[PDB]
Amino acid sequence: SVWKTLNKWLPPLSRDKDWWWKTLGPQINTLLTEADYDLNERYEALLLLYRWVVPEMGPRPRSSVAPSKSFMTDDHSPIEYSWKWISGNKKPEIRYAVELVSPLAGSKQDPFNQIPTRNLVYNLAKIIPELDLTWFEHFWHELLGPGSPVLTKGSTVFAALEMLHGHLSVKVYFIPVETPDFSAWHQIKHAIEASGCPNLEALNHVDAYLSSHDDGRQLRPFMLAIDLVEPAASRLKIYARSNQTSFRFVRDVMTIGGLRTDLDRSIEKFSDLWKRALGLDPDTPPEDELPKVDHLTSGAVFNFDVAPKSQIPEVKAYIPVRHYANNDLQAALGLIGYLEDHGHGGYSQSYLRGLDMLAPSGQLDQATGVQTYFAVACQGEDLSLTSYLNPQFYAAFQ
Ligand SMILES: N[C@@H](Cc1c[nH]c2ccccc12)C(=O)O
């Protein structure tokens, strides 16, 4: 094991850091091994983890009570893994989002725990010269800076590392603090308009859908995600959540009220996957809402990519497995069955072994929580799928 080797020879850590090292290290190493990453990339990922992530994770879990109300996951685990299924039975892409913490979190010097993420981004920029920080600083000052603004989701920023087989990408997520006169969408839209975009036609499409369309008026934007590459090549993901959960609503959102055409085949496959992943009756009417779940992150959630060189925005929908499925094994078998039916499930067993590694001992088939979302994007006539995973440090405290 790469982690066993590194842990054997790297200098020992303090109690808290060692706990994070011996927990996150094996988890990341297992996910990367099952996805067939070469050895050097596993060493690199664990060396980065040991040097720049583990020291900034704060005190180790000691109970089921979390030290913060982090918006990363429902149980406030500050780590979320993701497993992107690549078509053609190619190797999956492993990514992980992290919200680092410091003792200053909550104080006047850092009331919303932003400094650790900024430090991580600059540290990564030192080692990765291809990283561009122009949009990082622009959106940082616009959304979280001294000029920005009561109501908070539990976090305001976090970062993600994407191991794209041979190179590393970094993403940054901003969760604006809302005030009675400055909602999250107002701040995000103003920041994008002030970012120097060549064409803002897709942003206007998203704005018109959100403001005027009956279904689009039911969505509440809350988060913005950018890529730390050249701004012409970076995506602009605008996340929005709604209380409605019927697939008729989900479908209308995927098409942005009919703006996007030629998606009938993809949406049919989406409908099948939605029902299988959630364990719904095959004849469930698309106009029926899902049974009510009352939670901060319940309902249907999406993101709109308003990227340049594309006048029509793209939509990714997230199937909230943790809130509406029966149990993790059932949702996993539905996803894997869909993949098998379309000849895209070469890494299904590897994925199941990863779930077994991540799951709290004896809970896959009786509870939810491990798989947070199944992300679905429509690519022509096929689906692009991603599994998001919560290690559940506190809800499953061992
Ligand atoms: N945990 C928050 C933010 C978040 C993390 N990963 C996500 C993936 C998709 C949508 C939102 C999220 C939520 O569920 O909303």
For the chain, the domains span: 61-389
Residue 318 annotated as binding site: yes
Rounded Cα distance between 256 and 264, Å, is: 14
Residue 96 annotated as binding site: no
Ligand 1, atom nearest to 74 Cα: 1
6 Cα: distance to centroid of ligand 1 (angstroms): 32
Three-state DSSP state, 161: strand
Q: Please give the resolution of this entry in Å, rounded to 1 decimal.
A: 2.3
Single-letter amino acid code for the residue at 345: G
Ligand 1, atom nearest to 318 Cα: 9
Three-state DSSP state, 79: strand
Residue 209 annotated as binding site: no
User: Which residues, at least 6 apart from 48, have a Cβ–Cβ distance to it below 8 Å?
Assistant: 127, 161
Identify the residues whose C-beta falls under 6 Å from ligand 1: 71-73, 80, 239, 297, 301, 318, 373, 388
Q: Is the dihedral of CA 131, 137, 142, 145 positive or negative?
A: positive
Helical packing angle, 134-144 and 184-193, nearest 10°: 140
358 Cα: distance to centroid of ligand 1 (angstroms): 18
Q: Whose CA is nearest to atom 5 of ligand 1?
A: 72
Residue 71 annotated as binding site: yes
Q: Which one, of 133, 136, 143, lies nearest residue 112 by Cα? A: 143
What is residue 70's DSSP assignment?
A: -
Q: Say if CB 190 and CB 121 are below 8 A apart.
A: no
- E strands in 146-243: 157-163, 168-174, 220-227, 236-242
Q: Which one, of 134, 87, 55, lies nearest residue 339 by Cα? A: 87
Q: Say if CB 374 and CB 352 are below 8 A apart.
A: no
The two tokens of residue 306 are: 């308003």
Rounded Cα distance between 159 and 170, Å, is: 7
Q: Say if CB 56 and CB 120 are below 8 A apart.
A: yes
Residue 293's CB is within 10 A of a number of other CB atoms, namely 14
- The H or E element that residue 371 is part of is strand 371-379
Euclidean distance between the first and final Cα of the chain, in Å?
A: 23
Q: Whose CA is nearest to atom 14 of ligand 1?
A: 297
Experimental technique for the deposited model: X-ray
Give the C-alpha distances (Å, rounded to integers) separating 298 from 290, 323, 372.
11, 7, 11
Residue 60, classified by CB atoms within 10 Å of its CB into exposed (0-12), middle (13-18) or buried (19+), is middle
Which of 319, 386, 388 is the best mutation target for the ligand 1 pocket, counting ligand atoms within 8 Å of the beta carbon and taking the most?
A: 388
* Distance from the Cα of residue 296 to its chain's centroid: 16
Residue 316 annotated as binding site: yes
What is residue 108's DSSP assignment?
A: T
Ligand 1, atom nearest to 303 Cα: 10
- β-bridge pairing 79-85 and 314-319: unpaired
Rounded Cα distance between 56 and 24, Å, is: 13
**Torsion, Cα of 266, 323, 315, 377 (10° steps):** -40
Instruction: Tell me the sheet residues that pair with 172.
Output: 159, 226
Rounded Cα distance between 199 and 209, Å, is: 18
What is the residue whose two structure tokens read 């989406």?
Answer: 270
Residue 343's CB is within 10 A of a number of other CB atoms, namely 10
Q: Say if CB 104 and CB 115 are below 8 A apart.
A: yes
Q: Whose CA is nearest to atom 15 of ligand 1?
A: 297
268 Cα: distance to centroid of ligand 1 (angstroms): 25
User: Which residues, at least 6 apart from 104, have a Cβ–Cβ distance to it below 8 Å?
Assistant: 110, 115
Residue 351 annotated as binding site: no
What is residue 23's DSSP assignment?
A: H
Single-letter amino acid code for the residue at 167: H
- DSSP letters along 321-358, please? HHHHSS-HHHHHHHHHHHHHHTT--TTHHHHHHHHHHH
- The H or E element that residue 45 is part of is helix 39-48
- DSSP letters along 262-312, please? S-HHHHHHHHHHHHHHHT--TT--TTSPPPP--STT-SEEEEEE--SS-SS
For the chain, give me the number of helices (H) and strands (E)? Answer: 12, 10
Which of 70, 73, 83, 296 is the best mutation target for the ligand 1 pocket, counting ligand atoms within 8 Å of the beta carbon and taking the most?
A: 73
Q: Whose CA is nearest to atom 6 of ligand 1?
A: 72
What is the residue whose two structure tokens read 């993600």?
Answer: 160
